[PDB]
Amino acid sequence: PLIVPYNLPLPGGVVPRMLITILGTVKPNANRIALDFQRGNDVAFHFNPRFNENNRRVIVCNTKLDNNWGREERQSVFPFESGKPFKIQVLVEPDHFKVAVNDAHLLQYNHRVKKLNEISKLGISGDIDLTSASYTMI
Ligand SMILES: O=c1oc2ccc(F)c(F)c2cc1CO[C@H]1[C@@H](O)[C@@H](CO)O[C@@H](S[C@@H]2O[C@H](CO)[C@H](O)[C@H](n3cc(-c4cc(F)c(F)c(F)c4)nn3)[C@H]2O)[C@@H]1O
């Protein structure tokens, strides 16, 4: 285990074919998880599983620019479960991030922040026991 909140540096930002893998276990009674791919203070890609938003589960994705959240993209397919180990894989592609959880495709999120080579940190927060966070080029 690693202790959250956790910052993974992404030196020189991200690039297509970079596969970022986050392993952990959802806590009991979890309420929220967040991945924040950041360009300085801007959040190029916020990936935010919510376990209880109006008594249902949803994945909220967004971008934050100049400290203002933009338009949300929401996905009801929700592959996480309280108490269970997960693998989130974020595959950087030329026009989008592609997210697969537990080896099943979940969603794609088109790049709003264009300067991929400046998206130099991944923040990991929320109701998890973090196991590892790493990346490789496929
Ligand atoms: O209004 C509606 O009405 C409906 C009605 C019906 C329906 F079907 C709908 F879909 C809707 C949908 C809407 C839209 O909802 C909006 C709107 O209300 C808005 C007003 O300002 O506020 C946000 S909340 C805001 O969203 C951000 C992403 O956009 C971040 O996630 C923030 N955020 C989380 C974290 C964080 C920090 C941590 F440390 C963690 F560990 C962690 F996991 C997360 N930090 N920041 C979050 O605070 C709402 O989602």
Swiss-Prot record:
A major expression is found in the colonic epithelium. It is also abundant in the activated macrophages. Expressed in fetal membranes. It is found in: Cytoplasm; Nucleus; Secreted. Keywords: Acetylation, Cytoplasm, Differentiation, Disulfide bond, IgE-binding protein, Immunity, Innate immunity, Lectin, mRNA processing, mRNA splicing, Nucleus, Phosphoprotein, Repeat, Secreted, Spliceosome. The modification Phosphoserine is found at residue 76. A motif (Nuclear export signal) lies at residues 114-129. It comes from the Eukaryota. One of its GO terms (cellular component) is immunological synapse. One of its GO terms (biological process) is negative regulation of NK T cell activation. Residues 6-136 form the Galectin domain. A beta-D-galactoside binds at residues 69-75. GO terms for molecular function: carbohydrate binding; chemoattractant activity; disaccharide binding; IgE binding; laminin binding; molecular condensate scaffold activity; protein phosphatase binding; protein phosphatase inhibitor activity. Probably forms homo- or heterodimers. Interacts with DMBT1. Interacts with CD6 and ALCAM. Forms a complex with the ITGA3, ITGB1 and CSPG4. Interacts with LGALS3BP, LYPD3, ZFTRAF1 and UACA. Interacts with TRIM16; this interaction mediates autophagy of damage endomembranes. Interacts with cargo receptor TMED10; the interaction mediates the translocation from the cytoplasm into the ERGIC (endoplasmic reticulum-Golgi intermediate compartment) and thereby secretion. Galactose-specific lectin which binds IgE. May mediate with the alpha-3, beta-1 integrin the stimulation by CSPG4 of endothelial cells migration. Together with DMBT1, required for terminal differentiation of columnar epithelial cells during early embryogenesis. In the nucleus: acts as a pre-mRNA splicing factor. Involved in acute inflammatory responses including neutrophil activation and adhesion, chemoattraction of monocytes macrophages, opsonization of apoptotic neutrophils, and activation of mast cells. This is Galectin-3. The lineage of its organism: Eukaryota, Metazoa, Chordata, Craniata, Vertebrata. The gene is LGALS3. The chain holds residues 113 to 250 of 250 of the full protein.
